Amino acid sequence: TQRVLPYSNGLYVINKGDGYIRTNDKDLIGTLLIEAGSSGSIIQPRLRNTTRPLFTTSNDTKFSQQYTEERLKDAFNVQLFNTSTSLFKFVEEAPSDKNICIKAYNTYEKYELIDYQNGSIVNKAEYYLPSLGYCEVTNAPSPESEVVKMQVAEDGFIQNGPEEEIVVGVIDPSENIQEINTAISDNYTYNIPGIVNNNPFYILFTVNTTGIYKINAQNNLPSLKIYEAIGSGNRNFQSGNLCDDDIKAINYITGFDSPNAKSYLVVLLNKDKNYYIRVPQTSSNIENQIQFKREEGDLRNLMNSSVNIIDNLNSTGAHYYTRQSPDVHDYISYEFTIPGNFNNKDTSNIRLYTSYNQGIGTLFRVTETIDGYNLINIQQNLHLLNNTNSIRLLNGAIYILKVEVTELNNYNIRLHIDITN
Amino acid sequence: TQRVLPYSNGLYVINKGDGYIRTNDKDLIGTLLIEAGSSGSIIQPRLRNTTRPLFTTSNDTKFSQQYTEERLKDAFNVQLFNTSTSLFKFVEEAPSDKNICIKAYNTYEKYELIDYQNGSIVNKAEYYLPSLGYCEVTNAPSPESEVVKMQVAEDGFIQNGPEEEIVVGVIDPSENIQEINTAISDNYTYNIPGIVNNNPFYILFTVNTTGIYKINAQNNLPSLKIYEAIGSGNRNFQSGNLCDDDIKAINYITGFDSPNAKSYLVVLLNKDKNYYIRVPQTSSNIENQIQFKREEGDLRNLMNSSVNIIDNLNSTGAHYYTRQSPDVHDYISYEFTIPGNFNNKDTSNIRLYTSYNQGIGTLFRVTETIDGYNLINIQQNLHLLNNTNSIRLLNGAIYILKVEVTELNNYNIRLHIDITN
Amino acid sequence: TQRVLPYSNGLYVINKGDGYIRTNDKDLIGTLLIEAGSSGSIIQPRLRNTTRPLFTTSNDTKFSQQYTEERLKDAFNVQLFNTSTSLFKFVEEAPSDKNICIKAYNTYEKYELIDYQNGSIVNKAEYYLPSLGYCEVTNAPSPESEVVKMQVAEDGFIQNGPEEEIVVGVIDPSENIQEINTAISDNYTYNIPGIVNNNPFYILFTVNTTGIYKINAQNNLPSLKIYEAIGSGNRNFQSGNLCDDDIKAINYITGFDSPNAKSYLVVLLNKDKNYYIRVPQTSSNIENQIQFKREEGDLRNLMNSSVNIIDNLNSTGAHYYTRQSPDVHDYISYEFTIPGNFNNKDTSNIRLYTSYNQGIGTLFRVTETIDGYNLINIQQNLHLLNNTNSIRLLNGAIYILKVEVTELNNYNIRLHIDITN
Amino acid sequence: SDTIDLADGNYVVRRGDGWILSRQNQILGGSVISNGSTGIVGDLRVNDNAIPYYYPTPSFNEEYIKNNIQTVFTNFTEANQIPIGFEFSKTAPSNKNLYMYLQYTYIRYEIIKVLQHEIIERAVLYVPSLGYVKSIEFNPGEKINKDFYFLTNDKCILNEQFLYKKILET
Amino acid sequence: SDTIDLADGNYVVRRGDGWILSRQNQILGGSVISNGSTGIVGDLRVNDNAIPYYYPTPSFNEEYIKNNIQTVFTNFTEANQIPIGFEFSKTAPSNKNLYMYLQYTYIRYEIIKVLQHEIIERAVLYVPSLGYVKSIEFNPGEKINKDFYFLTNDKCILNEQFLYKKILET
Amino acid sequence: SDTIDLADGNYVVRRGDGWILSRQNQILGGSVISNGSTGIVGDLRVNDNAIPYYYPTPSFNEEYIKNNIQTVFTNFTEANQIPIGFEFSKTAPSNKNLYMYLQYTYIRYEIIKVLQHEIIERAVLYVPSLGYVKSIEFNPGEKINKDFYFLTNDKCILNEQFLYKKILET
């Protein structure tokens, strides 16, 4: 009954909430018994600035405390771990009727650092950042009930703060960040430099005018991913140039991790934002280029998604293609050619369906003119999950299927393209 | 019109209350004139921890300030004399009608250290421990009445705190404390070691089972005193063993100071308590032993008291015996033999009375069996003070008179045993 | 439309009020947005004692910051300029209805140091002493109105405290202060010592009995000024002696600055006060004396004022005499002789008037007896301003005109004495 | 857009107090108070929490930014050496739990280059001001809006301002 | 008695917060407030008032006590190096005098040896927690109960507790 | 006058708390609070604000003054080494402005020489006590009484006192 985490490969820092306390009173500051009418206070005055963060890792050599702290700084801009100048204080006035107790606990804000790879966590660290306390008030204990013995609880935490799950992706520090210093207009070709050979790396770039862009490598290989720098473009600005604010907190937009898969990106970019492209590890010594193109035509209908180029569709029968499933309400696209000669008459029966994930699909007929690529919407509201409906398409023709995930039941999405005749 | 202090010989520390201030504004912190509706505060923030205790002694060479402080530590566990981390603060909001003044004074908790010997104080020290202040509010002074001149008061203190007299006896530090490491059951014989020859000393011991014990030295010489360690047995515990918590705060139970007087102790001891026996200075080189015996029989009726063995009762006429009077509701006992041959027929007229202190007496006939000592109650509710009533007792028979003091008019109790025939 | 400042020559320190802040938010501490029901505080806890006074001068070499501070100490007894141990704190509870903002500003108390000479300021310094803050609360800003751009204001201050103008004269530090150590009774002659030759200086003296005194130099040259030491005589006291409290804060009483003008002083002196006489720079090497005389007779009617001795009145026609005008409700007097032989019959027509300042005048006939000087009031309620009324006076007779200024329109007062016949 | 009715040249701009920064919102931690109690959180602006955030541009480096801001507006280098405190108080209603968290506020300063009624270059400086607390009453297991915890873009909790002065050449 | 339904062996036991010690009650002093005024007394738990009270036994020495307590429950050596304050407020009613005095509270820990459903050995550790104030309104010359001033035996001002864990052999 | 019903000789006199000094009134500064807000000003009596003001006479020099005062009355040299704080609170009414300023208060001591029912010599010592705030509500441009700001002669804001003791010869 585990949730499906449709996260892209990479690092994530997760704020799992505030007000965590350890078990067995390990973080009890103390209790005050306040008589009726009176008041009582418990104070953390910061006469000393020292705090005691808690840390556990599954991998001391990669996710060390130093590394984990740098990741929390990348994500949420935390900078004080050992120290604090922030005071907290709890005050309670007991009502005129009865006496009152207040218990004060030290608390922690829980951060989880994960390395997520191909559908599971491969590295995990928990960092409990010292917080600003928890105060529970109760009625005064009566004499004496009776003391009932209790075994200690297992080691662990209890949250007393509100529910919270804030997920922030972060730049992998082991990978280089190259920059495109000039803002991108209608076209741009980025040559992949030898300074970053073979290893995966990021490309930081911005755009001149808000619009939809097609991004890809030569022959759509390898597949790329694109991120948005969270909170970028709110500050320093130079017309037609990139302003790097050293933001390592990233929002995944679209893109596959499988590098041998042909694909291209169609994304809406804001001129007041910075974006990261991640190009993966390539096992070839051949020179490559990242191409940027502003889309003014029908290709705009594919935002935001990666478009898979399907090549092996040259015989009839059953064919399937597996990719990482987009999250709910996100898109994935497929460009394919019906096998056979295009003679504008010969046709084949095509059945498109998914195996586990429910998706709404729209089918486009693709024709390239001297004005660019034209998309004719020929099928709408296709419900893909175990779809038995079939349609007759032209042999040798080119089609694009755009799929919106609506029910995420599997980490992967499996598209089937069954062809008969 | 002086009170009678029925204290046993030894050292006492007396908490005489809080909120003492010196005369002539010597401890005035200051005055705040608060206008109507406004508020005012006077604060002791402990930015410096220094305090200034006051001390006077009648004997610098025994009751020095060092010694006196050690005695206050023995009694009440005070440990900070020069310093304090305890804050105090006074706040006043003036009513909407009139203006208000608040005067704040530094205060002292007054401790008296006394050496009490044979019915008077022979050494005396006063230690004024710095306390947490006194705040009096008054209406705003009017213009101008007129300033009337006043001579300064004599040097001294004024108490503004509530009435308090807490008397705590303490172990004399000049005397050794020997220990009985094994808890006492039915019988025990403690040999007096040569390491503590001649000098008075204490014996620290505990008991296995709550019960009444007879305690005495060889031939009931010398007379012993027994104390309870205040607050002992609340903490560390080992079955059948003594756990010494180094408690020097002692509650006198019973026992005489006159060492040449034959006596024994009959006391109720708790298994969850520690007790001190004080054996006095003995002017003999002969070996002695302290004997402990659990009483299961009629001797239980004598708790808690010392029993005086009277020996010189071999002629008719008037006889008197002086001892330190027990406090009100406390006991003292006397074991005596009617002069003459015991022939079960010859009898004498006996008159028992006290001179100044009123006491209720009960008379026991003592017969020793092979099962122990038997006590036959033959007289109840004897009002001893100037008693003229007389009773006929058997010559050569043994009797025990148990006296409960009900009116303490004299430091001493004087028992008279007048015998005629 | 400038005010007339009728100040005597010398130094003045003026407290121009509290709660001054600079323009363009230069002294903004910050803003707190407090939600409804909640409270917020802004605190200056003095964890560091450092403050930042502001200073501007027109003359760095005389009115330096050091000098100016010494003058503020002379006037108001300020002693801490760089530092402060005084805390301030602003607290605001937002009502249940709406949210609330509080803005806190650092403030300054503005002091002006002026050197005032012959009707204008010749040296000027402004010292802004760090004060205890300004707190304005406002309703919570609404989204979003719209941000309207504004050019910055000119550099300067804004007062948020109440209106204040406290003017305190101070002793010129460059001039010596000589002392008359014996309190003055009926008569005293102070010889001017060679230790203070030529240069102007002060004479500090007190009086034995409250009364009216005539003070002057030999032949009424030079003219003197008299000051009162503000707050003197409230403290240390020795019968018949002067007690110097080193008070340099002075209240001008009367006296002219023009040293070649013959005059004498008639002033009411309190025995519980100290007074300063300032004798000006004299361009003569001749020995001089200051004479003190207690007035018991008619000369008492001239208090408090300087009396000008007019000498050049030996022909008929128009004559005018210019002096510094006393402030409103203050006095100035003139002693003159009607030209001609005194034969008790020959008379002249005299017209007395002022040119710009309105004054009420009373005219005295002066006759000297063996009992002293006698003043016969011969004219009352003379309205001097452009007075056309004339009176017939005796040739060779001596008169004194006492003038009370009622309307100050000019820095100078111009008395005209027109004589016809 | 970035259009402004000003002449050509460089300007110092004070954009006002009350600015909060993105992502940074919960890094100081927060308090959980319950059932009638009062929670008070505060801080102390000195030394290494008063260090400002610079965002320079090719024309406007850090020293240029500092000097022009401290000349026209408040000198934050002198001011922030002297400790200033601030506190916030919240009271939990009976039988309910309240969570309150603290974050710093900043004065936002800008250096803008204007050419033909258009801002073509902008440098930004955030100087630490005071603080700001947000609070919410919550039940066990109640889902809370992400927006309450996490701020995606810098915003001003007050009304924004635009107080300018033209910078003249050396 | 000292009978307990546990197996044989040694145990660490947390007996709870709110313990006050005998004889010690008034040694910090107290305040006297009058006629409408408010008195506030407090303290600061650091260094040499946070030093705990050990009471070892032949089986359980101090180091054994410290290590087992700090392993299972709170590490007081690390915690008590960081200053924590606490305050109490009392208000005197009009035309009456009020005396308030302060004393520390402790967490009580125990090391017990159990043999045949019986506690045959017990070590005790008191670790300083916070504090507790008692107050009384008084007239001049009014006799006050001795029990108000002086505590003869250790007691818990709260409900006692018994939170145990069996200690396993080296 | 300076007539007193005492025998001949020298006396130490405690003239009471609550004395304010002339000219000195506003030198600590003041606060301006507005519209419902509360202003709290205070100070801390230590070291170099607790240094007393001596005013000796030919018979009574400073050391004579100090020794006789500290013998009979409070020893201010020992006392004023230990920091004591004091605070005042004022609340501005809605839609009005309030100005509050602070000044120190002093205990006034005197050494007097009496001859034939007459004080012929008097030395004075002012020892810093606590403080005192005056406040006023004001409108923009409203003229304020000079007496509110500036004190011409030393006065006691409380009732004056005269607590004497005759000084006996060495």
Ligand SMILES: CC(=O)N[C@H]1[C@H]([C@H](O)[C@H](O)CO)O[C@@](O[C@H]2[C@@H](O)[C@@H](CO)O[C@@H](O[C@H]3[C@H](O)[C@@H](O)[C@@H](O)O[C@@H]3CO)[C@@H]2O)(C(=O)O)C[C@@H]1O
């Ligand atoms: C019609 C057909 O043959 N479909 C096969 C497809 C297509 O070859 C492919 O989708 C076109 O791009 O591939 C299938 O298996 C691939 C799939 O599992 C993906 C998942 O991302 O990975 C591919 O292998 C990767 C491997 O995972 C990498 O770690 C690395 O080793 O490289 C290889 C690629 O060279 C699988 O080939 C599919 O299910 O989509 C199988 C279809 O039969």
Ligand SMILES: CC(=O)N[C@H]1[C@H]([C@H](O)[C@H](O)CO)O[C@@](O[C@H]2[C@@H](O)[C@@H](CO)O[C@@H](O[C@H]3[C@H](O)[C@@H](O)[C@@H](O)O[C@@H]3CO)[C@@H]2O)(C(=O)O)C[C@@H]1O
């Ligand atoms: C019937 C009779 O003789 N009674 C005398 C009694 C008994 O001898 C005695 O009580 C039996 O133990 O003793 C009386 O005087 C003694 C009494 O004052 C006690 C007070 O505690 O002290 C005895 O002297 C002590 C002395 O006080 C010590 O300081 C030390 O010197 O030792 C001697 C004892 O050797 C008195 O002898 C009595 O009143 O009880 C006198 C009776 O006549």
Ligand SMILES: CC(=O)N[C@H]1[C@H]([C@H](O)[C@H](O)CO)O[C@@](O[C@H]2[C@@H](O)[C@@H](CO)O[C@@H](O[C@H]3[C@H](O)[C@@H](O)[C@@H](O)O[C@@H]3CO)[C@@H]2O)(C(=O)O)C[C@@H]1O
């Ligand atoms: C009737 C007559 O001549 N009146 C003249 C008067 C009288 O001579 C004088 O008032 C009697 O004392 O003087 C007038 O001018 C004098 C006047 O301006 C005063 C102002 O204080 O100053 C005198 O000159 C000063 C000069 O200002 C000083 O700086 C210094 O240089 O010394 C001289 C004095 O020697 C003027 O002589 C007057 O208006 O009062 C002119 C009258 O005509």
Ligand SMILES: [Cl-]
């Ligand atoms: Cl699927």
Ligand SMILES: [Cl-]
């Ligand atoms: Cl008796």
Ligand SMILES: [Cl-]
């Ligand atoms: Cl005129």
